Amino acid sequence: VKNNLLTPKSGEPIIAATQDFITGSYLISHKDSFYDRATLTQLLSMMSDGIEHFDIPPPAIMKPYYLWTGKQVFSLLIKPNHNSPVVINLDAKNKVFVPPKSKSLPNEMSQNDGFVIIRGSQILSGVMDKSVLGDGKKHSVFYTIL
Amino acid sequence: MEGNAQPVNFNRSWDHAYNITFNNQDKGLLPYAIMETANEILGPLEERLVRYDNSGCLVKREDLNKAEYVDQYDAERDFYHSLREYINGKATALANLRKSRGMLGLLEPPAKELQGIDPDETVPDNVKTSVSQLYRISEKSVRKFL
Amino acid sequence: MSNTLFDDIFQVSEVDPGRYNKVCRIEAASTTQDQCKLTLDINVELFPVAAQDSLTVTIASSLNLEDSATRSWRPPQAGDRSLADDYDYVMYGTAYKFEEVSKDLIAVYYSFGGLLMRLEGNYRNLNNLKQENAYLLIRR
Amino acid sequence: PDREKIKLLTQATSEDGTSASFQIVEEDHTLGNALRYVIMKNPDVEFCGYSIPHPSENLLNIRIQTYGETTAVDALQKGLKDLMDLCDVVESKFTEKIKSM
Amino acid sequence: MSNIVGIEYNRVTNTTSTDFPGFSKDAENEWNVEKFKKDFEVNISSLDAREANFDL
Amino acid sequence: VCINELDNWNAPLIMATCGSKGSTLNVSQMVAVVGQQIISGNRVPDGFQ
């Protein structure tokens, strides 16, 4: 089942997040979800079983309190530290994608989070809504590391 | 195979090549120079394809595409023409940028003359931190694209 | 001063919390230079912003104001004078894309971990490289 | 003594005791979440979570990871010495109010 | 902060701990037994057999 | 009408903004109208007389 993540009908990936792993990894990457250090650490220590070595990136919100975001905790399950070799680049359009002002502002500046941007295995925009994780579409996350 | 039944995905493979070999300490190149770094690799790739005629020997260098000596392959020979023309459509974008940004955009290469006209010293230092600050292409970033 | 890359004073225009409850995109307009403007994401449970208000933007770098092999990140000590001991709300993030708006108008995309920003200048913001680390700094 | 207890995973530790990962038998969330609160109040630890690997078997994995000051194996031995002192305040204060009532 | 879970009509807010050093720059509320022993109090409400009611 | 005039943290809204399960057709039959039933390309032909 490692050599058959792809179906030979079309070439799309067939083994991805089923209908409850999407909506779990969407409430994390919701734009108004902010974690401090002790809650990120507990969140970051359930994706493994206390074996993988993480190194914490510097947090987003910094002056009033120390706050991370729900994408810096999701850009750690791709490249957890320097010794892991995964570094990817991907530009994908979500399931809804309400369009911006359509001539000046580019595809990233949608009204919602919209178009997803990842550069060097850090999420820069967009959410995870079955267009970037799940089945069907050729440009998913799990297709790129494969 | 990647999207639309071609095994390339020229967009993502460029942006994967651009992040993995990114630096600002390296210099960068000029629009005429990057095509010869491209033709250095896939140059010798094409002359391995010999284009014999229907009877053993070679055919004359005039009127190759005549729908009559199409041998055991043409799409692999047509594959390198599309990898050249993708960079050619991006070779002009640097030139047509640096044209309208004040400098002379030398898409055409110079001949046996004063080698290194080098318009660095001519235009002021605002222009060198104008074009290369927006976007830029190393010689490493074309060795790792193709 | 030695580390500040950019600084102006803005009067905000529009605050549209579209389908959120804790993050709303703002609008701005520079009151001294008459060209540049930006859009920015502010989490307003801890820095509440109202329409038609004055505030400062300051893109510094390496706030330590002068000058353990663990690859992690650690905060500074409790007693330390530093930059942004005088503002109200700083952020942190990377640049990813530079593209020109029109003739002699270039735009700059900073993204602070999910929270985007787009400002466009006229080569007035010359010092903004494509470096890894830049910090916004805001007073009220 | 016994040695089917707290146990350092050599496969997932650093060359010194800065980062270490343990495996504790017979003990579920009731210790695994109490020990997380009392450890993270150390000004030296940067990363301390736990994880139950599978609910059929019964063993907890506690993770501990700090800066260069003190070793992590010295951080939790200070940490679970400090939960012991946390119950002495609760047991004493509760029992002197019952007698009062 | 201010240790109040915020009830509203579709959510609750800041339910987690935020009681640890390394949360703000002024890294206060470190562990200290004497700083704990003063603030912990117990108030016993109606107590009988077969039922207890008391606060922590 | 029922989609844009509908608050966030609605439960059949937040799993149809994703692609996990549902549609904007299936939630519209639950709150607004279930539409006209088809019978093999025919809009319920007559039963008798």
Choose the closest CB to D53 out of A38, A49, A56. Answer: A49
Q: Say if the Cβ atoms of B12 and A90 lie within 8 Å.
A: yes
b/e per residue, E15-28, with b = 16+ CB within 10 A? eeebebbbbbbebe
Question: What is the H or E stretch that residue D24 is in?
Answer: strand D24-25
Q: Is E11 on the interface with F (CB under 8 A)?
A: yes
Q: Say if the Cβ atoms of B126 and C100 lie within 8 Å.
A: no
Chain A residues within 8 A of C71 when measuring between CB atoms: 55, 81-82
Distance, CA of B12 to CA of B29 (rounded, Å): 22
The residues, any chain, with a CB within 8 Å of residue F4's CB and separated by 6 or more, are none
Q: How far is E12 from chain F (nearest CA, A)?
A: 12
Distance, CA of D20 to CA of D65 (rounded, Å): 7
Chain C residues within 8 A of F8 when measuring between CB atoms: 19-21
Q: How many CB pairs under 8 A join B and C?
A: 16
* B102 phi-psi bin (left φ>0, alpha ψ -120 to 50, beta other): left
Burial class (CB in 10 A: 0-12, 13-18, 19+), C113: buried
Q: Residue E6 — φ and ψ, nearest 5°? A: -95, 100
Chain C residues within 8 A of D46 when measuring between CB atoms: 72, 74
Domains of chain D by range and CATH?
Answer: 1-101 (3.30.1360.10)
Q: Give the mutation candidate from C21, C74, C87, C88 for the E interface (greatest E CB count, under 10 A).
A: C21
Distance between alpha carbon B49 and the CA centroid of its chain, in Å? 20
Q: Say if the Cβ atoms of D67 and C69 lie within 8 Å.
A: no
Q: How far is E9 from chain D (nearest CA, A)?
A: 30
- C37 - beta bridge partners? C120
Choose the closest CB to D89 out of E27, E29, E37. Answer: E37
Q: Say if the Cβ atoms of A130 and F15 lie within 8 Å.
A: no
CB B9 within 8 A of CB B16: no
Q: Is A65 on the interface with E (CB under 8 A)?
A: yes
Distance, CA of B58 to CA of C29 (rounded, Å): 69
Closest B-chain CA to A88: B16
- The interface residues of chain E toward chain F in range 26-45, judged by CB-CB distance below 8 A, are none
Closest A-chain CA to E15: A39
Q: Say if the Cβ atoms of A134 and F19 lie within 8 Å.
A: yes
Query: In 3D, which of B116, B112, B132, B143 has the Cα closest to residue B37?
Result: B143
- Cα→Cα distances B57→B49, B52, B73, Å: 13, 6, 16
Q: Any idea of the CA torsion for B115, B121, B124, B130, to the nearest 10 degrees?
A: 50
What count of Cα atoms within 13 Å lies in the side-chain half-sphere of residue A134?
A: 21
Distance, CA of F18 to CA of C44 (rounded, Å): 26
Number of structural domains, chain C? 1
- Copy the structure tokens of residue E37: 């022993």
Choose the closest CB to B15 out of A11, A89, A138. Answer: A89
Burial class (CB in 10 A: 0-12, 13-18, 19+), B14: middle
The single-letter DSSP state of residue B2 is B
The span from the first CA to the last CA of chain C, in angstroms, equals 19
Q: Do chains A and B touch (3 or more CB pairs under 8 A)?
A: yes
Query: In 3D, which of B3, B21, B57 has the Cα closest to residue B142?
Result: B21
Q: Residue C109 — φ and ψ, nearest 5°? A: -110, 105
- Report which residue type is found at B113: E
Distance, CA of C79 to CA of E25 (rounded, Å): 9
What count of Cα atoms within 13 Å lies in the side-chain half-sphere of residue B58?
A: 7
List residues of chain C with CB under 8 Å from any CB of chain E. Answer: 21, 75-76, 78
The single-letter DSSP state of residue E48 is B
Chain E residues within 8 A of F9 when measuring between CB atoms: 10-11
Q: How many CB pairs under 8 A join A and C?
A: 86
Q: Is E50 on the interface with F (CB under 8 A)?
A: no
Chain A residues within 8 A of D46 when measuring between CB atoms: 37, 41, 56
Distance, CA of C107 to CA of C36 (rounded, Å): 9
- Copy the structure tokens of residue C57: 């933007």
Distance, CA of D46 to CA of A59 (rounded, Å): 13
- Cα→Cα distances C25→A109, A110, B6, C110, Å: 11, 11, 40, 14
- Copy the structure tokens of residue C140: 């009220």
Choose the closest CB to B135 out of C98, C123, C126. Answer: C98
Domains of chain A by range and CATH?
Answer: 23-146 (1.10.274.100)
Query: C124: domain range?
Result: 1-140
Distance, CA of A26 to CA of A133 (rounded, Å): 11
CB A115 within 8 A of CB C104: no
* CA dihedral for C16, C22, C26, C32, sign (positive or negative): positive
Q: Which residue has the tokens 């994967």?
A: B16
Chain E residues within 8 A of C76 when measuring between CB atoms: 25
Q: Which residue has the tokens 């009392």?
A: D38
CB E31 within 8 A of CB D89: no
Q: Do chains D and F touch (3 or more CB pairs under 8 A)?
A: no
Q: Do chains A and C touch (3 or more CB pairs under 8 A)?
A: yes
Q: Give the mutation candidate from E11, E25, E28 for the C interface (greatest C CB count, under 10 A).
A: E25
Q: Say if the Cβ atoms of E47 and D101 lie within 8 Å.
A: yes
Q: Say if the Cβ atoms of C75 and E26 lie within 8 Å.
A: no
Distance, CA of E16 to CA of A39 (rounded, Å): 8
List residues of chain C with CB under 8 Å from any CB of chain D. Answer: 68-70, 72, 74
Which chains contact B through at least 3 pairs of Cβ atoms less than 8 Å apart?
A, C
What is the crossing angle of helices B125-134 and B75-100, to 10°? 140
Q: Say if the Cβ atoms of B3 and A138 lie within 8 Å.
A: yes
Resolution in A: 3.7
Closest B-chain CA to C130: B133
Distance, CA of B9 to CA of A144 (rounded, Å): 12
Closest C-chain CA to E14: C45
Q: Which residue has the tokens 């500046």?
A: A109
- The interface residues of chain E toward chain C in range 1-56, judged by CB-CB distance below 8 A, are 11, 22, 25-27
Q: Is E53 on the interface with A (CB under 8 A)?
A: no
Distance, CA of D10 to CA of B129 (rounded, Å): 51
Q: Say if the Cβ atoms of F7 and E10 lie within 8 Å.
A: yes
The residues, any chain, with a CB within 8 Å of residue D13's CB and separated by 6 or more, are D19, D20, D21
Q: What CATH number does residue C70 fall under?
A: 2.40.50.140
Distance, CA of A121 to CA of A106 (rounded, Å): 21
Q: Say if the Cβ atoms of A60 and C22 lie within 8 Å.
A: no
